[model samples]
Every structure is written in C-alpha cells, then in structure tokens.
Target: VPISEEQAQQMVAKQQAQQERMEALEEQKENMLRAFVSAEGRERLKRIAQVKAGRSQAVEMHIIQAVQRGKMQPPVSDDTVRELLGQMANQEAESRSHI
Candidate 1:
C-alpha cells in the first residue's frame, strides 16, 4: 500500500514537534535541577550521569517530586546529596542480596 504525500509530511511534522517539546522539557528539568542543588551536588549529578543516565534522571525526578511535595528546600546541601546517594546504594545492595 502507498501512503499519501500529505500523510508523510504530517507525520514528519508531528515527530519534529514532539522532539522539540522533549528538548524543551529536558532543558526545563535541567534548569530546575540546577536551582535546587549546590555546586558539589551538581558535580556529583554530572558524574552519575556519566555512569548511569537513568539513575541521574531518577535523581532529577526525585528532586522535582520533593520540591512539589514541599519536602525539600532549594539549594540542597552536599551532605543531603550524599545521603540520598547512600540510600540508593543501600537499596541496590538489598535488591542484589535478595536475588
């Protein structure tokens, strides 16, 4: 079956729009993360991003959720970031041990 030219153009346009929106949202998330963390915290996040992109993204989402819930304050301290990482490490260890 042959697809119409108009249909292909619409599909390409939709994909481009979706990609742009995703980039915007990712930028927003990065900005929000920067506002919430200190220099050291940001550095640690960068290192985590190098090793595990998904884990870094999870940390970003965690910070956003914490802010939304009013559970965390802006400019989170390095100690707080360390504690969060430790907690994640422990969770992973527990999961590994269980399996």
Candidate 2:
C-alpha cells in the first residue's frame, strides 16, 4: 500500500536533513581551508575545491586562461568568500563581526 501524505512528507524531510548535514560538513571544511595556506594560496585551493565539488573544470580553466591573457583580473581570495557567506547568512539575524 502507498504511504499516507504525512508519512511521505516525513521521509522527504529526513532525506533533506541528511543532505543538509553533508553540505554543512563540506562548507565547514571550505571555511577552514585558509588556516593552512596564504591568502593567495587559498584562492588557488578554492578553485580546485570548487572543481572537486562538482563545478565545471573546463569553464574554470577558460576563465583562468582569460585572466592569463589579460582579459580579466585574477580572482579574489577565498577568505572573501567566507566573509560574504557569513554576511549573507547573518545579515539580519546576528552579528558576524564580533563572532
């Protein structure tokens, strides 16, 4: 027999929570990447991580090549990304500066 709507909803919520947990772990690792590297080094590392995290490498490579050819400036540091994420998340709910 098919499950009731409430049961189906519960199962979906459980799966979503599991996915969120996995993503949160990955984000934690991403945030800590700068502790082991210089700011410039972290920018390079972030690109690699994004590729490994399922980004399109060909596109990243093309952008890098464009920068190499002077079509674009080199990208900013990964620490900037961390700051941006924190700012977005805590915009109205909390203070990231004092944390």
Candidate 3:
C-alpha cells in the first residue's frame, strides 16, 4: 500500500499564505483611509470604486504615496482627491497622445 505525501496540503498552504498577504494589504489600506482620508473623500472614492475600481485604486495608491512620503497632509480633502483624479486622467491622456 502507498501513502499519499500530502502534496495537496502544501499547495493549499502556499495559496493560503498568498491570500493572507492580500488580506494584510487590504487591512493596511483600510487603516490608511480611516486615518488619512476625509469622510467626503472616502465617499467619493467609494462611488468611483463601484464604477471603476482601478481608478479608485490609482487614486488611493497615489494618496498613500503622497501621505507616506510627507508630500501631502492627512485627512485628504475632497478637492484634493478630485485634483489627483484629474492629474491621473491627464497622465493617461498624455501617454496616449505620446504614442
């Protein structure tokens, strides 16, 4: 009789570790939003996320970079979010035109 080496368990373990890493990132993101994003800004991002999650992620990523690097103040205002969104839009447009 042959016994299984439990390779499936190893595979599941690797997947579980990756998923946990992803969850950790989301948790960090939630903390950042609560501490650094204003209520209006969060609502606006939430609206955008429902429609275009990538756009929302881009904005949030940019906001996090700016805040963490000391380039932006905490509790980011709605107008600031709008401005960053506009900037990202402009960059996309510019890149398209360049090619």
Candidate 4:
C-alpha cells in the first residue's frame, strides 16, 4: 500500500523514541535502587529479574514507592523485600486469573 513508506517510518521512529525513554527510566530506577538497596535485597531483586524481568520492574517500583514515602531506611535487605515481592507476585497472579 502507498501508506507503507511514510507510516512505517513514522511508527518506527516513534518506537525508537519510546525505547530511548525506557532506557532513561531504567537508568534512573537503578540509581535510586543503589541509593537504598543492600546486597541481600539486590541479590533477591536480581534473582527475580533473572526469571521474570517484567515482574521485577514492577517490584522495583513498589520498593521505590516505599522509599519515596520514607517507610524504610537505607540498606534495604532481603527481609525488607520479603513482603514486597510476596504481595506483588500474588497480585499479578490474581489479576491474570481474573482475566
């Protein structure tokens, strides 16, 4: 179709910009994690990411929200992530099941 060339370029360029934005967000997410997450929590986060990178980002945001609200202090350990990861995984599973 004649729509292919112009639309294709426009759509591809848009997605490229989106990926750039995602990378910037990911960089910011890590910097904040390093500010608070201890080695144990980092390990737990990494392992979860290894299996489910998608879920881990949401989990990271959950932790980020907690820190932003001053619910926890620096050196977030494995124990700190205990209920965080538990609740995240359960909620996602429940949502998917309902769908």
Identify the candidate with maximal TM-score: 1
TM-scores of the models, in the order given: 0.85, 0.41, 0.81, 0.65
| Cα distance off (Å), candidate 1, residue 33 | 0.3
Q: List candidate 2 stretches off by more than 4 Å.
A: 47-99
lDDT by residue (1-99, candidate 4, tens digit) is 668888999999999999999999889988999887877788788899988777767868777888899977776878877667878788889999987
Which TM-score value belongs to model 4? Answer: 0.65
Worst 10 residues of 2 by lDDT: 53-62
User: Between 2 and 4, whose lDDT is larger?
Assistant: 4
- lDDT preference between candidates 1 and 2, better one: 1
**Worst window of 10 by summed lDDT in candidate 4:** 54-63
Error of 1 at 36 (Å): 1.3
Ranking by lDDT: 3, 4, 1, 2
What is the C-alpha local distance difference test score of each model? 0.82, 0.53, 0.88, 0.83
State which candidate has the highest lDDT. Answer: 3
Candidate 1 C-alpha lDDT tens digits along 1-99:
499999999999999999999999989987888888888988887788788776666676787899768899988877887687777767778888986
The lDDT, on a scale of 0 to 1, for candidate 2 is 0.53
TM-score winner between 3 and 4, please give it: 3
TM-score of structure candidate 1: 0.85
